[PDB]
Ligand SMILES: *C(=O)CCCCCCCCCCCCC
């Protein structure tokens with residue numbers, strides 16, 4: 001569905017994974033989180049709203065922080081994703097992140113991803129993405145970007161915790177902020193706040209998507 | 216050296232079977248692959264094969280291998296021998312992936328003809344657009360569904376008792392891939408593929424050859 | 430705590 | 445036959 005979407009840009013996919021090579025011809029891949037489902041773009045369901053003021057203290061609020069960005073707008077570009085992460089894992093290892101975006105227009109875009117601990121930035125990754133023309137529109141893809149060391153270590157530390165409630169306790173103060181901007185106009189195309197809990201489902205990782213509103 | 220002309224380089228090619236254990240867990244088996252491990256200092260020099268030795272294994276007459284080679288450029292022509300890993304083991308997806316780079320921004324057409332006794336049995340045609348990437352252009356055919364004929368073919372190979380029998384079937388099976396600049400009709404890459412069954416401990420293998428006039 | 434914030438009921442119900 | 449044609453020795457030697 002065209003859910004995490006402003007008028008200029010739609011995020012179709014987000015996934016973080018662990019890939020293990022048994023032998024040169026055999027690979028096992030485990031997904032921590034994902035967005036993506038089999039429904040067409042126009043399926044776009046009604047999304048519940050979250051008063052953005054309720055989440056400000058989990059992100060940096062300096063010049064160029066979440067409040068600043070939201071007030072500058074467009075406010076219809078702002079979303080909150082809550083993930084229930086699948087941490088049930090078991091050869092050489094690769095930790096990766098993959099994402100996909102679509103637009104009707106050909107832009108050069110910048111994706112900024114900031115990991116936050118107690119509302120303070122601990123690590124940032126910046127990527128510039130160019131379009132491929134595809135099926136009547138423009139596609140932007142990040143394919144198997146290497147997960148940074150801080151996050152690999154964070155996942156290791158969480159897994160060594162004896163109890164699932166303890167993992168959830170650590171996650172109360174862990175957030176990620178993603179800003180996607182048109183490099184030429186400096187327009188905010190998408191802004192996605194992420195928060196995490198440990199999944200207890202047997203049908204894999206789960207999510208809920210919310211619009212962020214001024215209230 | 217690599218599968219590269221002056222205008223296009225194929226850095227990645229693979230055919231695979233992917234199986235979903237559960238919604239977050241996937242197993243992938245590679246039948247054949249190029250560029251799975253990174254290009255290195257020690258990669259071997261490419262030996263040469265006289266193309267007149269192989270004409271009968273590929274479509275000929277108008278637009279065939281001979282016709283294409285003579286039009287050239289000759290530096291775009293390669294022969295790959297694969298030793299395929301058929302030792303496989305929920306939902307299943309058979310796919311082919313490939314990746315290319317060029318210094319030029321082009322619209323390319325990739326034609327893949329599966330042949331038996333040198334005659335086409337099925338063809339698959341894909342048009343690919345470029346993506347800008349650090350001063351050059353990249354093209355990707357990503358998890359293209361393997362067509363029924365090849366899925367069926369792989370099943371039937373496995374249902375033969377002996378490997379030498381699999382090799383005998385494969386002696387009359389070829390694949391020809393031609394990549395062209397759609398605008399100019401220039402041949403960017405032409406790759407002939409031939410197969411045997413692997414007996415290696417370290418998985419699927421390949422040798423790559425330049426096709427030459429002598 | 431997140432549990433005392435004004436948020437929809439779904440935020441605490443894993444689909 | 446394939447095995448008798450002029451090709452490098454590597455053609456019938458799996459790496
Ligand atoms: C390092 O470069 C910072 C970029 C972070 C990439 C986002 C990864 C999303 C992590 C999801 C898995 C979290 C499981 C608790």
Ligand SMILES: *C(=O)CCCCCCCCCCCCC
Nearest residue numbers: 230246299311327339361362365
């Ligand atoms: C259908 O889409 C035919 C197109 C052929 C694509 C090339 C696939 C290469 C298969 C290699 C597997 C070898 C198994 C003996």
